[PDB]
Every structure is written in structure tokens, then in C-alpha cells.
Amino acid sequence: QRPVNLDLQTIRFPITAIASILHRVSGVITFVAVGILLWLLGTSLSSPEGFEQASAIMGSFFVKFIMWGILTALAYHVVVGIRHMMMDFGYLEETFEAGKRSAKISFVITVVLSLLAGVLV
Amino acid sequence: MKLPVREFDAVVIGAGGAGMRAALQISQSGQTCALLSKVFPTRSHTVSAQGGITVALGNTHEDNWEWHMYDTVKGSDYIGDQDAIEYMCKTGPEAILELEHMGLPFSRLDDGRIYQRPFGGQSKNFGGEQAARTAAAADRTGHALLHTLYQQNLKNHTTIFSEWYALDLVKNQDGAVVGCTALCIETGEVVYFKARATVLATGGAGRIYQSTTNAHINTGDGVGMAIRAGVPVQDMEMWQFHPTGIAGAGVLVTEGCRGEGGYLLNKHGERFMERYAPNAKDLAGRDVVARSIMIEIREGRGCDGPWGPHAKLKLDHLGKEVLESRLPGILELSRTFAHVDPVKEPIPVIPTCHYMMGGIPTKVTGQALTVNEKGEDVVVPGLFAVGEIACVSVHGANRLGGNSLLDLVVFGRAAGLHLQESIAEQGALRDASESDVEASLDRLNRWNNNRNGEDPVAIRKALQECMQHNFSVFREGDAMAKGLEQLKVIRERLKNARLDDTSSEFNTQRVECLELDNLMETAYATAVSANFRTESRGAHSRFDFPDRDDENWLCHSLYLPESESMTRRSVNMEPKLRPAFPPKIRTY
Amino acid sequence: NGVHDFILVRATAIVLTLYIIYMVGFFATSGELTYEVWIGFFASAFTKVFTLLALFSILIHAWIGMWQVLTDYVKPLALRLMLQLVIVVALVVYVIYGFVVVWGV
Amino acid sequence: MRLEFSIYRYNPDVDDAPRMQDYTLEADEGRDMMLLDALIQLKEKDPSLSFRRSCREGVCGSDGLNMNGKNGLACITPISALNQPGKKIVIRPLPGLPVIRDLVVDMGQFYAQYEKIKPYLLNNGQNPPAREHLQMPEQREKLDGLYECILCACCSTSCPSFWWNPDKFIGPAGLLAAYRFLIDSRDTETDSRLDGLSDAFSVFRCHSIMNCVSVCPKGLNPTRAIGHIKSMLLQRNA
Numbered sequence A: 001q002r003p004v005n006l007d008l009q010t011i012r013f014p015i016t017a018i019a020s021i022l023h024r025v026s027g028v029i030t031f032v033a034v035g036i037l038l039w040l041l042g043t044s045l046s047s048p049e050g051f052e053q054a055s056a057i058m059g060s061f062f063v064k065f066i067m068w069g070i071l072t073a074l075a076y077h078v079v080v081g082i083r084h085m086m087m088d089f090g091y092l093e094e095t096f097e098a099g100k101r102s103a104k105i106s107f108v109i110t111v112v113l114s115l116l117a118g119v120l121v
Numbered sequence B: 001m002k003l004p005v006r007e008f009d010a011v012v013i014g015a016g017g018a019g020m021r022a023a024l025q026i027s028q029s030g031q032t033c034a035l036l037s038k039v040f041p042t043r044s045h046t047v048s049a050q051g052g053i054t055v056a057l058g059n060t061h062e063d064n065w066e067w068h069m070y071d072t073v074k075g076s077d078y079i080g081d082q083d084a085i086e087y088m089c090k091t092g093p094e095a096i097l098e099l100e101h102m103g104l105p106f107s108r109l110d111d112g113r114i115y116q117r118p119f120g121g122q123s124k125n126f127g128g129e130q131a132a133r134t135a136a137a138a139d140r141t142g143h144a145l146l147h148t149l150y151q152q153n154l155k156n157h158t159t160i161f162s163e164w165y166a167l168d169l170v171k172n173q174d175g176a177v178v179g180c181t182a183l184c185i186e187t188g189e190v191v192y193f194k195a196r197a198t199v200l201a202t203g204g205a206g207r208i209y210q211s212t213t214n215a216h217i218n219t220g221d222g223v224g225m226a227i228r229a230g231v232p233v234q235d236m237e238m239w240q241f242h243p244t245g246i247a248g249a250g251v252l253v254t255e256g257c258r259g260e261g262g263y264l265l266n267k268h269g270e271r272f273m274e275r276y277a278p279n280a281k282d283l284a285g286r287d288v289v290a291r292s293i294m295i296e297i298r299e300g301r302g303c304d305g306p307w308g309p310h311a312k313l314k315l316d317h318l319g320k321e322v323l324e325s326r327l328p329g330i331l332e333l334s335r336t337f338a339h340v341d342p343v344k345e346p347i348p349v350i351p352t353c354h355y356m357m358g359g360i361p362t363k364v365t366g367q368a369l370t371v372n373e374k375g376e377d378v379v380v381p382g383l384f385a386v387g388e389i390a391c392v393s394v395h396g397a398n399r400l401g402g403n404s405l406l407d408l409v410v411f412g413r414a415a416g417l418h419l420q421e422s423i424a425e426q427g428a429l430r431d432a433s434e435s436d437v438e439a440s441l442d443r444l445n446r447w448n449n450n451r452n453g454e455d456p457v458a459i460r461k462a463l464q465e466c467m468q469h470n471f472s473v474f475r476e477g478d479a480m481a482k483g484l485e486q487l488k489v490i491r492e493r494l495k496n497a498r499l500d501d502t503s504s505e506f507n508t509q510r511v512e513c514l515e516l517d518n519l520m521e522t523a524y525a526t527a528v529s530a531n532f533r534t535e536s537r538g539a540h541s542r543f544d545f546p547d548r549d550d551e552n553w554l555c556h557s558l559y560l561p562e563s564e565s566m567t568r569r570s571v572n573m574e575p576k577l578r579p580a581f582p583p584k585i586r587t588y
Numbered sequence C: 001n002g003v004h005d006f007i008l009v010r011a012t013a014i015v016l017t018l019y020i021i022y023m024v025g026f027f028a029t030s031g032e033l034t035y036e037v038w039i040g041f042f043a044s045a046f047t048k049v050f051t052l053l054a055l056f057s058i059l060i061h062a063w064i065g066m067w068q069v070l071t072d073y074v075k076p077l078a079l080r081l082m083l084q085l086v087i088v089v090a091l092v093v094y095v096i097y098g099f100v101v102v103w104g105v
Numbered sequence D: 001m002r003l004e005f006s007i008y009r010y011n012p013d014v015d016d017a018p019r020m021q022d023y024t025l026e027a028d029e030g031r032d033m034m035l036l037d038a039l040i041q042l043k044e045k046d047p048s049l050s051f052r053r054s055c056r057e058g059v060c061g062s063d064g065l066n067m068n069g070k071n072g073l074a075c076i077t078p079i080s081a082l083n084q085p086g087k088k089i090v091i092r093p094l095p096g097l098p099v100i101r102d103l104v105v106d107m108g109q110f111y112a113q114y115e116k117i118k119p120y121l122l123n124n125g126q127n128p129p130a131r132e133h134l135q136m137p138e139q140r141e142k143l144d145g146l147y148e149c150i151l152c153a154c155c156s157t158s159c160p161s162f163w164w165n166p167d168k169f170i171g172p173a174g175l176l177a178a179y180r181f182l183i184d185s186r187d188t189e190t191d192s193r194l195d196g197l198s199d200a201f202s203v204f205r206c207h208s209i210m211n212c213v214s215v216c217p218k219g220l221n222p223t224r225a226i227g228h229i230k231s232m233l234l235q236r237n238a
Ligand SMILES: *Cc1cc2c(cc1C)nc1c(=O)[nH]c(=O)nc-1n2C[C@H](O)[C@H](O)[C@H](O)COP(=O)(O)OP(=O)(O)OC[C@H]1O[C@@H](n2cnc3c(N)ncnc32)[C@H](O)[C@@H]1O
Pocket: B013, B014, B015, B016, B017, B018, B019, B036, B037, B038, B039, B041, B044, B045, B046, B047, B048, B049, B050, B051, B052, B053, B054, B141, B142, B164, B165, B166, B167, B201, B202, B203, B204, B213, B214, B215, B217, B221, B222, B252, B354, B355, B386, B387, B388, B389, B401, B402, B403, B404, B405, B406, B408
């Protein structure tokens, strides 16, 4: 049966494709994260003691890191999701130049939101 | 039969404009039809055609098919067959309108009609004012045409054998063509396509020259196939050199550049075509323009640079808007291949081998002709040809721009409309024996078994160099005689040439070696024919016989492959719908 | 069909964006997070309703999205159907657990 | 000046699996050739090296290749655009399709997706024109950017959605062709065509990855064409 060239290390991906695969990954991560946030929210709401315990969980440095990652993936998924919708509705042009430009601005905005997420934590 | 046999009513060898239009027609007439092509169909050279289709639509100004007929006859320098030119010009408008109904994306006038531009050799009123009759899709008309025809073939479910290489015609013991052997490039499989009608539609052969506008695949396969089957070819000395190939690259820039208002300059900034063709100027016949450029260069008035000697094609005065809308493809080609932006600077150009006026003589029905021992025309039963491989002849000694695409469509369609009658007229054909099929494999078995002979690459290069030095725009008896001797030697080397790749899965070397045989036959026929024609007419121009000679040479030249010798064939001068155009001195 | 998925993903994206703005709004303007203010926020009818509406939006949005991912990278049918089952079940559990958490506050 | 290449080789009667083979070519210092020129010369020295080509002027679409990681046409890719000091010029087949031999891929799936969108004029024959269909320059402008496609597959073989579902996602080139008939004012079957493009896969597997636009050797923009199809699908089915 015939071989195919699909060796991903040998192929150039422009920034728009990087933006794009990260949007997919951030969506999957966020899917799992929702469960974790709900488990955490449930605990923080079950009683006064459930609440102190959620704070103690959030006090942990390892947990701060995870929670920061979750918020970053979320921010990324939201920002680049909005970018997607702006193209769909004609607010952003669908040219390669515009795609590059809007991807970059999307990364900058995400970095800012990821720093604000660090602070909030 | 030790080879697989695939049987159809018709086998069409070639899927350019002519072959695809023919297959479509043959199929719609109820006959089974196999369309073969050595590349995927939309990669045929037609796909590179630029300027458009010359046809009396009467859109840009009131027109008349007889004006077009006149331009064509005069353009051909009086050896175009006038009954055939009449059929083409009169049939043209409806045949082209049918492409538009198939969805061809023609450019448009303001009132929504098909856009037509001026082109070389176009006049109103039988030699009057410049006409504009070349229908265009910007300057990618060949692309638009071929893709549309392919689309129609998908729609029609035509049986297409893509990337099959036809090797040689198969003849039966009565001398009738009964199909061809072919090689499947993907698998290496060899097959006999058996047919009642075998239609050559294999295109031209510009690759016999060192510099050509033609695709790498333009190797004259149908000329070699005809010749090896004992079928003659006609007017092979008549090679069109397009006046404006890019200098140093060979890549064409369309005559639509001059049609839209561009013109040629020499190193003094003289618009020299005003001198050489006071009426039509830069829109004179191509043989005349091409010679005029070479005369400027020869006499020290050409330009030079990184590109080599050349004339300048100035377009900038048309403006960015007209250039990007009417001529976008030549913007790309000039930038890429000349490193010159036509919006700002003139394109360096030189005459470059472009089109084969010669080929397999045919009737308007597409049936191939041979001659008997008495020199009379007789149909070759089972064989047809359409398109640049055919010599109907509607182009004579110099083809008009835009008239080849018209030819592909008019004659591809005609072969298919007439196929049932042609098959009925020729009668039932005897079957090929196995030895008949075997004879069609001899050439292939030679290559498959020769490991130790000569390098095909040097042979191809020598052949190209010979044609370029000796059978170019200006010819001379002594040089041509020597050229011919050199080709005989090269042709002998070719009989001992080696195949270095013996593999079977997409082996392109084998295909290129088989093509080399067809370049050799085409070059050889061309050289014998050019030596033979002792006069100058249209594209054929000789220092030792500088004059047109209507008494001896108002006729076709015919190369007889069994004796490797020449004879002459009558030119038709009996149109049905109007009177003949008498031969006269031809100036632009 | 495809038009239906495309619209639903985008309709729910808009609802979740509003919900995120609402939630972030709260977080970034509430100083010390006492148990008291935390529970007062989630006891509000507005917060309860919005959170359940977000949860339904997630069920819809993430289902389409995860289906898109699985139909790209997981070819063996049985494995794929199994993964879809786990994923739908998880999303439905998210909603139901959400109902249990807020109706308990 | 010496040019160094690493080129993908595969012959099923000889190789167990594909390999890269190194080649050297002496070039003229003062001249910049196209990659196709270089390949043609490598084949003079290794007759077994197989690749497609024809027009050598960027119009026929024969010679799509992955060059230093990026799809394009060998015939209009200057060597100076590929040649980096101390690195090999890497030539590989278009990604995602079966490799027949060396640099030649089986384009079968690419053509099948093209046929699926019925790329030919559909006109119901009512109100026939007297001669040609009349199409104003403004209507004809809509085909610019769509009818120029040379079917080279550089775009589709660079699209991840096309890699994962080459038999259900139409792919950028095919959708560009669909849009070409969708907005042709002489095509009367617009609604039928949109009805055939409403499933989850034909059009909607496009995620605006934009690999298609970045590689098109003719400067076309499938992403935008695809956007317009999605709008027409909403307009008709939402
Ligand atoms: C070179 C050129 C010519 C040209 C032009 C621009 C260029 C760069 N612009 C033109 C224009 O604007 N108007 C016009 O009237 N003519 C123009 N020309 C000339 C014209 O394009 C050509 O003469 C014409 O397109 C020839 O078409 P035709 O159908 O006769 O043949 P083809 O397109 O060259 O296709 C040949 C087919 O045959 C197949 N083939 C060849 N050999 C074999 C074998 N051995 N076995 C199987 N198939 C074979 C090829 O695969 C191809 O499909």
C-alpha cells in the first residue's frame, strides 16, 4: 500500500495555522476544565467548611499553576473564538495579511489576559 | 493476442482543445469513445494559450465571416485551402457561442456581449481598416477554454485514460489504422486500444527547437506515429515563430499586447513596424513581424542586456488599469521570467518558435489523407487528425493569431459530427493480427532492452541546436543542406540510444526517450521539407530563393515516409459560398 | 446538518461570552472574598439562572466541538462512539451537577 | 556555486519505504534558475528521478511540490528563494496524498472532490439568449479570482481538514470551484448546489486555518470564497 508524505516536522505552518491548532487544543482543555471548576465550585458552596477548604486548595502553589493554565487556555479560546466570529460576520477581512495581523493581535491580547489571570490568582 | 485489448468505436489520442471537443461530440453522437492523454487533460498546451479565439462574432464592431476568410487566406500566403478556411470562418461564430453556453468565462463588453480585441492580420472590408475580432478571457483564454471543455467532459462522463502514452498506430494487412498501442504511465502496463476510428489530436512539436514557447510535452508524437505508419505529413517546413517570446526565456507574451495598443521599439526608440508594414504596423502577419525584428537585430539596431539581443515591447502607456484587467497573465510572466514590470518598462522580446502549420493532411471531416502511386488523394481508412497535429490546411504558410483555438473547436467538433458517415464510408475493417500489434511495439522493445548505448540527453540537445541554427526564421540552402546531414548522423546515434531507468511505476525517463524518437522524426521531416521548398512563402524564408514563386510552389509540400522523399499537393481554391481569393502580392 | 451546527456553536459562544464578562466583572470588583459575599452572589436568582443557562450552552457548544475533534482524529468507529458516549455523559452530568449545586444554595 | 538537495525517493519495486537522497548540482554564480530547471538537470545525472512537469511557466499546475516545507510550483520557484547557506534544499511530494513514485502523487482524491461539486455550467434553458448569454462586466468581475485555478492541489494538500477527511471535506480548491459556479450569473441551479453543500463536512470542515491562501501560486483566496459559500448557506438554510 502506498506511502504518503504526512510528516508534520517537515512542513511549514504559517502563524494562522498555529493560531488555529491552539484554538482547538484550548477548547479541549477547557472542556476538561469545566468539570474541575464545577468540582471546585461545588466544594466552595456546600458549607462554611467547604469554603475554607476550597481556599486551602487554592493556596497551594501547584494548584495556582494549574488554575492559571486553565484561565489562560480559556482566555485564548475566547479571544481567538471572537476573532473567528469577526471573520464569519465580516468585521475582519479573510485575506492572508489580515489573518496574520489579527492572529498576532490575538496573541498579544491573550498574553495580557494571562497576566491579569496570574494576578487574580 | 498476448496484450490486453480495450475496444471502443473511437480512440482519441490527445486531450487538448481539439481532442476534448472531438471526444465530447463523438460521445454525444452515441459512439463509445476513449480519450487518451499523456498528462492530466487540463495540463495540455492549450491551457497556456493567451490572446483569444479569432471569430466573426460581430460584437466589438459589425463584422463578416468573409472578411475573416480573406484575412486568413491572405495571412496563409495563399497556400491555405480555401474550401477549408471557408468552412472554419463561416462555422466559427456558432461553434464559439456554444463554448460560451458551456460556461466559458469570456470577458465582456458593456452591453454584456463577448469582448473581442484587435489582433495580427485583422481587417474590415477585405484588407481595409484594423478589425477587432479575437474573443478573449483576459489573456488566459486557453486556460478558460480547456478547463471549460474538461468540465463538459466530466458532465458527459467521457471515458478518459489520463497519463497514458500512445506508442504507435496499429495497421491491419489492408493498410488500415485499427487503433494504437499505449503505455499506462502509472503502472507500466502496455495495451492495445482497438478502434474503428483513431483520432490523432496530439498537438505541436516546438520542442524540436532550442527555444520555444511550447510546453515540455510538445514533442510531435503524432508526427512520429504517422510517419512510422507510412502516413505522410504536409508543409512541415512551415513553422511559426511568434514575434514576441520573452528574450532569454522563450515564454510567450501575447500578441494581445499589441492588440491592446502596445508596440515594438528598437534601440533608437523607433517604432520600426511603421516602416516594415505601413498599414497594419505591429499587427501585420507574424511571419513579417518576426522577420522585421530579426532584421533590426541583425543590422545592429536591436537592444541587449542580461536578456540577450531583443526588441522592446512597450505597454506602459496603456496604464495600470488596462494592463491588470486585459493582460494580467503577461504581467505575471514578464515579472517572473524577465524581471521586468510591464507597467513601468518595456518587455524584452524576440521571435521564438511557436506553432506547427504542418502535419497530417486531412479532410474537413478530419479523415487523414495519403497519396497513391499516381499522386491522387486517398483516405487512410480508420485514421483521423484534428488540431495542431492536422494540416487541413486552414493556416497555409502562416497562421493568424487566434485561428488555432478556432480550428481546435471547429474541426474537433466536425470530426465528431462526421464520424458515423466516415466509419460507414470506410466500411468494416479487418482485424489486426497479433504480429500487427507486435510491430507497434518494436520501438518500445528497443528502448527497454538497450542498456549500453548512447545518452539520449546529448542527442536531444544536438537535435535542438541543429534546428535552431539551420531552420530558424532565416534559412539558406547551404546551411540547410548541412543541417540535414547532421540530422542523419544524429538520427543514427538515436537508433543505439540507451534507457537508463527500466522500472515500471511512473517511469518518466522511458516516456522522454520515446518522445525523443518523435522529435527526431519531426525534425527530420521538417528539414527535408525546408530544403525541398525553393522559394520564400509566409514563415519559410530563404536567402537563395527570396521570392514567392506561384508558378512552381503555389502548393503544399508532402513528405513521403517510405521513400523519405518529397512531392507536391494541390492547394484548394474552390470555396462553395463565394468566389476564390486570387493569389496576389502580400504586404501589410 | 452543518448549517445547524455552525449557528449553534456561535449562538452559544455569544451567551458564554456574556456569562464570562458577568463572572469576571464580579471577581474583579469584590475585594476580599468572604464566604458571605461569595454565597450572596451565587444565591442571587440572576446568578443561578445565568449559570444554568451557561451550563446548557456548554452542553451544546462543547458537544459540537468535541464531535468535530473526534471526527477528525479518531477513525475506528467503536472507539469513537465510546468516546462520544463518555463526553455527552460528562456534559449532561455537568448540567445536572450544576442544578444540584445551585438549587442547594 | 554548489547547490545541495535532499529529495524524496520512492519506487515500490525497489524500496521498502520512502527515503531522502542527497544530490549536488554545480550552478552558474551569475544566474538564478528555477527549481524545475534544477530538477531537470538532476535527472540528466539520475535518469530514475521522476516528477511531473509541462508548461514550465506556472500555468499548467503539473509540478506542485513541498519545498523547504512549503507547497508551490517548481517552475516559478527561484533557487535563490530556497537556497540557504549550510542547509539542504528539501524537496518532497505534496502532503497527504498517496505517493505513486518519487515526487509524483496520486491526485485521485483531489479530482474526486472537484467532480463532487459539479463543476460545470448548469443552466435550465429558460429564457435562452439570442446569441451568447449576456453577462455585464460587473457580473463577470465576480469570477475573477475563481476561474484562474490551475488545479495544482497546493492548497488542498496543505489543509489539515483535507488531510483528515479527504473524502468528505471538499477542500479549498474544490470549494473555490463551487463558488465559481455559485456566483456565475449564467448558472441557474444555485439553490440545488447549496442544498448539496449543507452537510457537516463538505464546506464546514473549513476552520480558517488559512494554509490555502498562503500557498496558492496564482494568488487566489479559497478562504474568502469559502466564507461567501457559508453566508449563502445561512441565507438559504437558517
Ligand atoms: C504555445 C502557445 C500556443 C498558443 C498560445 C499560447 C502559447 C504559450 N495562445 C494562443 C491563442 O491565444 N490563440 C490561438 O488561437 N492559439 C494559441 N496558441 C496555439 C494553440 O494554443 C495550440 O496550437 C493549441 O492549443 C493546440 O491544441 P491541440 O488540442 O491541438 O493540442 P494540445 O493542447 O497541445 O494537446 C495535445 C494533447 O495530446 C496529448 N498527447 C501528445 N502526445 C501523446 C501521446 N504520445 N500519447 C497520449 N497523448 C498524447 C497531450 O497529453 C495533450 O493532451
